[PDB]
């Protein structure tokens, strides 16, 4: 003799020892990224090609 069993309810596991099907469908995906940058240029110049006489002292 087994216990009371419902009629219209689905067959769910209810006690220790009942079986149940697991459908393994796992799909995980993670990601990350980053960056950084910096830059600097400089260029100076000056040239007195032909100096007049009254400025030759400087």
């Amino acid at each position: 003799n087994y216990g009371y069993q419902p009629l219209f309810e689905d067959r769910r596991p209810r006690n220790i020892g009942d079986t149940l099907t697991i459908v393994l469908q796992e799909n995980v995906s993670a990601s990350k990224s980053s960056s950084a940058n910096a830059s600097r240029d400089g260029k100076t110049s000056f040239g007195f090609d032909t100096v007049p006489r009254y400025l030759q002292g400087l």
């Binding site: 003799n1 087994y2 216990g3 009371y4 069993q5």
Partner: protein
Amino acid sequence: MTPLKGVDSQVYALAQGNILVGGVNQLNGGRITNGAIIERELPTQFGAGN
């Protein structure tokens, strides 16, 4: 021949016979007189105690 189960899914009676439909009236439902025979008995505590 049809077995009649309880709520514990055990056979308590066996049913077989001719159906009597009224013949508005219901056509998809009938009743059979003395159509089942008891096969299992239930225990009881009648007669025990005061």
